[PDB]
PDB file of N, CA and C in Angstrom:
ATOM      1  N   UNK A   1     114.977  68.133 159.732  1.00  0.00           N
ATOM      2  CA  UNK A   1     113.711  69.073 160.530  1.00  0.00           C
ATOM      3  C   UNK A   1     112.416  68.239 160.492  1.00  0.00           C
ATOM      4  N   UNK A   2     112.290  67.793 159.124  1.00  0.00           N
ATOM      5  CA  UNK A   2     111.257  66.878 158.697  1.00  0.00           C
ATOM      6  C   UNK A   2     110.873  65.969 157.298  1.00  0.00           C
ATOM      7  N   UNK A   3     112.479  65.720 156.915  1.00  0.00           N
ATOM      8  CA  UNK A   3     112.318  65.511 155.455  1.00  0.00           C
ATOM      9  C   UNK A   3     111.440  64.167 154.846  1.00  0.00           C
ATOM     10  N   UNK A   4     111.063  63.952 154.161  1.00  0.00           N
ATOM     11  CA  UNK A   4     109.790  62.999 153.697  1.00  0.00           C
ATOM     12  C   UNK A   4     110.693  62.058 153.897  1.00  0.00           C
ATOM     13  N   UNK A   5     109.832  60.691 154.093  1.00  0.00           N
ATOM     14  CA  UNK A   5     110.301  59.167 154.508  1.00  0.00           C
ATOM     15  C   UNK A   5     110.870  58.869 152.719  1.00  0.00           C
ATOM     16  N   UNK A   6     111.751  58.413 152.319  1.00  0.00           N
ATOM     17  CA  UNK A   6     112.253  57.653 151.467  1.00  0.00           C
ATOM     18  C   UNK A   6     111.557  56.543 151.039  1.00  0.00           C
ATOM     19  N   UNK A   7     110.368  56.304 151.158  1.00  0.00           N
ATOM     20  CA  UNK A   7     109.731  54.849 150.701  1.00  0.00           C
ATOM     21  C   UNK A   7     109.988  54.501 149.879  1.00  0.00           C
ATOM     22  N   UNK A   8     110.344  53.019 149.601  1.00  0.00           N
ATOM     23  CA  UNK A   8     110.616  52.493 148.363  1.00  0.00           C
ATOM     24  C   UNK A   8     109.548  52.732 147.424  1.00  0.00           C
ATOM     25  N   UNK A   9     110.001  52.364 146.049  1.00  0.00           N
ATOM     26  CA  UNK A   9     109.647  52.581 144.785  1.00  0.00           C
ATOM     27  C   UNK A   9     107.747  52.223 144.931  1.00  0.00           C
ATOM     28  N   UNK A  10     106.897  52.699 144.644  1.00  0.00           N
ATOM     29  CA  UNK A  10     105.480  52.419 144.863  1.00  0.00           C
ATOM     30  C   UNK A  10     104.820  51.764 143.597  1.00  0.00           C
ATOM     31  N   UNK A  11     105.746  51.776 142.650  1.00  0.00           N
ATOM     32  CA  UNK A  11     105.128  51.409 141.433  1.00  0.00           C
ATOM     33  C   UNK A  11     105.417  49.811 141.009  1.00  0.00           C
ATOM     34  N   UNK A  12     106.715  49.066 142.381  1.00  0.00           N
ATOM     35  CA  UNK A  12     106.347  47.516 142.740  1.00  0.00           C
ATOM     36  C   UNK A  12     104.513  47.144 142.828  1.00  0.00           C
ATOM     37  N   UNK A  13     103.910  48.230 143.373  1.00  0.00           N
ATOM     38  CA  UNK A  13     102.672  47.758 144.038  1.00  0.00           C
ATOM     39  C   UNK A  13     102.145  47.329 142.993  1.00  0.00           C
ATOM     40  N   UNK A  14     102.067  47.982 141.949  1.00  0.00           N
ATOM     41  CA  UNK A  14     101.172  47.346 140.753  1.00  0.00           C
ATOM     42  C   UNK A  14     101.839  46.261 139.450  1.00  0.00           C
ATOM     43  N   UNK A  15     101.379  45.229 138.846  1.00  0.00           N
ATOM     44  CA  UNK A  15     101.927  44.753 138.520  1.00  0.00           C
ATOM     45  C   UNK A  15     100.984  44.058 137.288  1.00  0.00           C
ATOM     46  N   UNK A  16     101.473  43.916 136.105  1.00  0.00           N
ATOM     47  CA  UNK A  16     101.110  43.986 134.702  1.00  0.00           C
ATOM     48  C   UNK A  16     100.984  41.692 134.765  1.00  0.00           C
ATOM     49  N   UNK A  17      99.522  41.631 134.616  1.00  0.00           N
ATOM     50  CA  UNK A  17      99.179  40.121 134.202  1.00  0.00           C
ATOM     51  C   UNK A  17      99.187  39.702 135.453  1.00  0.00           C
ATOM     52  N   UNK A  18      99.141  40.292 136.917  1.00  0.00           N
ATOM     53  CA  UNK A  18      99.779  39.618 137.902  1.00  0.00           C
ATOM     54  C   UNK A  18      98.980  40.479 139.322  1.00  0.00           C
ATOM     55  N   UNK A  19      99.297  40.125 140.109  1.00  0.00           N
ATOM     56  CA  UNK A  19      98.789  41.028 141.373  1.00  0.00           C
ATOM     57  C   UNK A  19      99.725  40.966 142.430  1.00  0.00           C
ATOM     58  N   UNK A  20     100.039  42.007 143.538  1.00  0.00           N
ATOM     59  CA  UNK A  20     101.287  42.272 144.300  1.00  0.00           C
ATOM     60  C   UNK A  20     100.490  41.959 145.895  1.00  0.00           C
ATOM     61  N   UNK A  21     101.098  41.173 146.320  1.00  0.00           N
ATOM     62  CA  UNK A  21     100.786  41.253 147.755  1.00  0.00           C
ATOM     63  C   UNK A  21     101.498  42.156 148.805  1.00  0.00           C
ATOM     64  N   UNK A  22     101.282  42.993 149.683  1.00  0.00           N
ATOM     65  CA  UNK A  22     101.807  43.303 150.603  1.00  0.00           C
ATOM     66  C   UNK A  22     101.466  42.785 151.901  1.00  0.00           C
ATOM     67  N   UNK A  23     102.626  42.792 152.745  1.00  0.00           N
ATOM     68  CA  UNK A  23     102.325  42.460 153.925  1.00  0.00           C
ATOM     69  C   UNK A  23     103.774  43.177 155.256  1.00  0.00           C
ATOM     70  N   UNK A  24     102.777  43.584 156.062  1.00  0.00           N
ATOM     71  CA  UNK A  24     103.544  44.159 157.443  1.00  0.00           C
ATOM     72  C   UNK A  24     104.527  45.571 156.808  1.00  0.00           C
ATOM     73  N   UNK A  25     103.325  46.602 156.416  1.00  0.00           N
ATOM     74  CA  UNK A  25     103.756  47.813 155.724  1.00  0.00           C
ATOM     75  C   UNK A  25     103.056  48.368 155.127  1.00  0.00           C
ATOM     76  N   UNK A  26     102.772  50.051 155.383  1.00  0.00           N
ATOM     77  CA  UNK A  26     101.764  50.970 154.967  1.00  0.00           C
ATOM     78  C   UNK A  26     102.434  52.122 155.526  1.00  0.00           C
ATOM     79  N   UNK A  27     102.527  53.464 154.200  1.00  0.00           N
ATOM     80  CA  UNK A  27     103.085  54.138 154.410  1.00  0.00           C
ATOM     81  C   UNK A  27     102.172  55.072 155.880  1.00  0.00           C
ATOM     82  N   UNK A  28     102.692  55.702 156.631  1.00  0.00           N
ATOM     83  CA  UNK A  28     104.206  55.948 156.593  1.00  0.00           C
ATOM     84  C   UNK A  28     104.864  55.134 157.366  1.00  0.00           C
ATOM     85  N   UNK A  29     105.130  53.717 157.103  1.00  0.00           N
ATOM     86  CA  UNK A  29     105.681  52.747 157.746  1.00  0.00           C
ATOM     87  C   UNK A  29     105.716  51.793 156.515  1.00  0.00           C
ATOM     88  N   UNK A  30     106.700  50.615 157.237  1.00  0.00           N
ATOM     89  CA  UNK A  30     106.863  49.490 156.546  1.00  0.00           C
ATOM     90  C   UNK A  30     107.692  48.715 157.462  1.00  0.00           C
ATOM     91  N   UNK A  31     108.831  48.839 158.219  1.00  0.00           N
ATOM     92  CA  UNK A  31     109.765  48.164 158.627  1.00  0.00           C
ATOM     93  C   UNK A  31     110.190  47.164 157.923  1.00  0.00           C
ATOM     94  N   UNK A  32     111.028  46.997 156.938  1.00  0.00           N
ATOM     95  CA  UNK A  32     110.943  46.356 155.892  1.00  0.00           C
ATOM     96  C   UNK A  32     109.886  45.279 155.434  1.00  0.00           C
ATOM     97  N   UNK A  33     108.932  46.035 155.240  1.00  0.00           N
ATOM     98  CA  UNK A  33     108.081  45.447 154.108  1.00  0.00           C
ATOM     99  C   UNK A  33     108.173  44.488 153.349  1.00  0.00           C
ATOM    100  N   UNK A  34     107.541  43.154 153.288  1.00  0.00           N
ATOM    101  CA  UNK A  34     107.644  42.590 152.612  1.00  0.00           C
ATOM    102  C   UNK A  34     106.487  42.237 151.435  1.00  0.00           C
ATOM    103  N   UNK A  35     106.931  41.368 150.097  1.00  0.00           N
ATOM    104  CA  UNK A  35     105.846  41.521 149.214  1.00  0.00           C
ATOM    105  C   UNK A  35     106.033  40.160 148.231  1.00  0.00           C
ATOM    106  N   UNK A  36     104.973  39.396 148.079  1.00  0.00           N
ATOM    107  CA  UNK A  36     104.771  37.953 147.225  1.00  0.00           C
ATOM    108  C   UNK A  36     104.296  38.833 145.951  1.00  0.00           C
ATOM    109  N   UNK A  37     104.905  38.085 144.999  1.00  0.00           N
ATOM    110  CA  UNK A  37     105.020  38.489 143.558  1.00  0.00           C
ATOM    111  C   UNK A  37     104.153  37.004 142.984  1.00  0.00           C
ATOM    112  N   UNK A  38     102.685  36.822 142.220  1.00  0.00           N
ATOM    113  CA  UNK A  38     102.174  35.826 141.541  1.00  0.00           C
ATOM    114  C   UNK A  38     101.125  36.458 140.446  1.00  0.00           C
ATOM    115  N   UNK A  39     101.579  35.991 139.275  1.00  0.00           N
ATOM    116  CA  UNK A  39     100.977  36.434 138.315  1.00  0.00           C
ATOM    117  C   UNK A  39      99.518  35.807 137.877  1.00  0.00           C
ATOM    118  N   UNK A  40      98.510  36.013 137.046  1.00  0.00           N
ATOM    119  CA  UNK A  40      97.217  35.370 136.759  1.00  0.00           C
ATOM    120  C   UNK A  40      97.468  33.720 136.482  1.00  0.00           C
ATOM    121  N   UNK A  41      96.626  32.633 136.423  1.00  0.00           N
ATOM    122  CA  UNK A  41      96.435  31.592 136.701  1.00  0.00           C
ATOM    123  C   UNK A  41      96.694  31.138 135.018  1.00  0.00           C
ATOM    124  N   UNK A  42      98.134  31.288 134.520  1.00  0.00           N
ATOM    125  CA  UNK A  42      98.391  31.095 133.182  1.00  0.00           C
ATOM    126  C   UNK A  42      99.851  31.315 132.481  1.00  0.00           C
ATOM    127  N   UNK A  43     100.185  32.611 133.511  1.00  0.00           N
ATOM    128  CA  UNK A  43     101.545  32.968 133.421  1.00  0.00           C
ATOM    129  C   UNK A  43     102.281  32.520 134.525  1.00  0.00           C
ATOM    130  N   UNK A  44     103.052  31.670 134.768  1.00  0.00           N
ATOM    131  CA  UNK A  44     104.557  31.515 135.917  1.00  0.00           C
ATOM    132  C   UNK A  44     105.648  32.160 136.048  1.00  0.00           C
ATOM    133  N   UNK A  45     105.670  32.839 136.970  1.00  0.00           N
ATOM    134  CA  UNK A  45     106.742  33.487 137.649  1.00  0.00           C
ATOM    135  C   UNK A  45     107.834  33.263 137.936  1.00  0.00           C
ATOM    136  N   UNK A  46     109.369  33.210 136.635  1.00  0.00           N
ATOM    137  CA  UNK A  46     110.391  32.710 137.000  1.00  0.00           C
ATOM    138  C   UNK A  46     111.346  33.557 137.423  1.00  0.00           C
ATOM    139  N   UNK A  47     111.291  34.425 138.426  1.00  0.00           N
ATOM    140  CA  UNK A  47     112.270  35.573 138.586  1.00  0.00           C
ATOM    141  C   UNK A  47     112.464  36.283 140.098  1.00  0.00           C
ATOM    142  N   UNK A  48     112.678  37.696 140.234  1.00  0.00           N
ATOM    143  CA  UNK A  48     112.303  38.209 141.228  1.00  0.00           C
ATOM    144  C   UNK A  48     111.127  38.123 141.468  1.00  0.00           C
ATOM    145  N   UNK A  49     110.363  37.243 142.176  1.00  0.00           N
ATOM    146  CA  UNK A  49     109.300  37.011 142.838  1.00  0.00           C
ATOM    147  C   UNK A  49     109.264  37.239 144.224  1.00  0.00           C
ATOM    148  N   UNK A  50     110.449  36.744 145.150  1.00  0.00           N
ATOM    149  CA  UNK A  50     110.518  37.531 146.307  1.00  0.00           C
ATOM    150  C   UNK A  50     111.201  39.133 146.611  1.00  0.00           C
ATOM    151  N   UNK A  51     110.773  39.861 147.100  1.00  0.00           N
ATOM    152  CA  UNK A  51     111.163  41.544 147.276  1.00  0.00           C
ATOM    153  C   UNK A  51     110.558  42.171 148.577  1.00  0.00           C
ATOM    154  N   UNK A  52     111.914  42.499 149.074  1.00  0.00           N
ATOM    155  CA  UNK A  52     111.242  43.309 150.219  1.00  0.00           C
ATOM    156  C   UNK A  52     112.267  44.956 150.659  1.00  0.00           C
ATOM    157  N   UNK A  53     111.382  45.839 150.512  1.00  0.00           N
ATOM    158  CA  UNK A  53     111.600  47.076 150.883  1.00  0.00           C
ATOM    159  C   UNK A  53     113.095  47.377 152.038  1.00  0.00           C
ATOM    160  N   UNK A  54     113.674  48.075 151.860  1.00  0.00           N
ATOM    161  CA  UNK A  54     115.072  48.301 152.635  1.00  0.00           C
ATOM    162  C   UNK A  54     115.494  49.551 151.920  1.00  0.00           C
ATOM    163  N   UNK A  55     116.160  50.595 153.109  1.00  0.00           N
ATOM    164  CA  UNK A  55     116.846  51.681 152.496  1.00  0.00           C
ATOM    165  C   UNK A  55     116.449  52.253 151.319  1.00  0.00           C
ATOM    166  N   UNK A  56     115.004  52.430 151.039  1.00  0.00           N
ATOM    167  CA  UNK A  56     113.838  53.210 150.379  1.00  0.00           C
ATOM    168  C   UNK A  56     114.561  52.831 148.915  1.00  0.00           C
ATOM    169  N   UNK A  57     114.324  51.227 148.908  1.00  0.00           N
ATOM    170  CA  UNK A  57     114.574  50.219 147.567  1.00  0.00           C
ATOM    171  C   UNK A  57     114.323  48.608 147.712  1.00  0.00           C
ATOM    172  N   UNK A  58     113.635  48.327 146.792  1.00  0.00           N
ATOM    173  CA  UNK A  58     113.833  46.812 147.013  1.00  0.00           C
ATOM    174  C   UNK A  58     114.580  45.869 146.602  1.00  0.00           C
ATOM    175  N   UNK A  59     114.541  44.937 147.304  1.00  0.00           N
ATOM    176  CA  UNK A  59     115.586  43.613 146.819  1.00  0.00           C
ATOM    177  C   UNK A  59     116.055  43.567 145.771  1.00  0.00           C
ATOM    178  N   UNK A  60     114.770  42.990 145.059  1.00  0.00           N
ATOM    179  CA  UNK A  60     114.475  42.279 143.999  1.00  0.00           C
ATOM    180  C   UNK A  60     114.153  43.288 143.210  1.00  0.00           C
ATOM    181  N   UNK A  61     114.025  43.876 141.881  1.00  0.00           N
ATOM    182  CA  UNK A  61     113.206  44.465 141.063  1.00  0.00           C
ATOM    183  C   UNK A  61     111.970  43.806 140.666  1.00  0.00           C
ATOM    184  N   UNK A  62     111.338  44.039 139.453  1.00  0.00           N
ATOM    185  CA  UNK A  62     110.111  43.383 138.476  1.00  0.00           C
ATOM    186  C   UNK A  62     110.874  42.431 137.702  1.00  0.00           C
ATOM    187  N   UNK A  63     110.261  41.318 138.244  1.00  0.00           N
ATOM    188  CA  UNK A  63     110.519  39.845 137.393  1.00  0.00           C
ATOM    189  C   UNK A  63     110.105  39.739 135.928  1.00  0.00           C
ATOM    190  N   UNK A  64     109.700  38.865 135.580  1.00  0.00           N
ATOM    191  CA  UNK A  64     108.986  38.250 134.324  1.00  0.00           C
ATOM    192  C   UNK A  64     107.966  37.167 134.410  1.00  0.00           C
ATOM    193  N   UNK A  65     107.189  37.202 133.945  1.00  0.00           N
ATOM    194  CA  UNK A  65     105.787  35.602 133.990  1.00  0.00           C
ATOM    195  C   UNK A  65     106.027  35.773 132.309  1.00  0.00           C
ATOM    196  N   UNK A  66     105.770  34.229 132.038  1.00  0.00           N
ATOM    197  CA  UNK A  66     105.762  33.459 131.152  1.00  0.00           C
ATOM    198  C   UNK A  66     104.460  32.598 130.745  1.00  0.00           C
ATOM    199  N   UNK A  67     103.701  32.987 129.461  1.00  0.00           N
ATOM    200  CA  UNK A  67     102.977  32.129 129.570  1.00  0.00           C
ATOM    201  C   UNK A  67     103.139  30.972 129.159  1.00  0.00           C
ATOM    202  N   UNK A  68     102.235  30.004 129.798  1.00  0.00           N
ATOM    203  CA  UNK A  68     101.941  28.428 129.701  1.00  0.00           C
ATOM    204  C   UNK A  68     101.787  28.160 128.242  1.00  0.00           C
TER     205      UNK A  68
END
């Protein structure tokens, strides 16, 4: 009838020791929104840097940034 859209986890939006970049997506919309991860100028991202919303779930979860 009008079930709420199963938008992907919003938690991913926020990231400690870094910043999350959103593009082509925003409730109540996303059309397979893509997001690029990148930590502060000191920690190098070595994991699920790239992630995209799909079927109410992101392809890759939260990665891990290591201090130089």
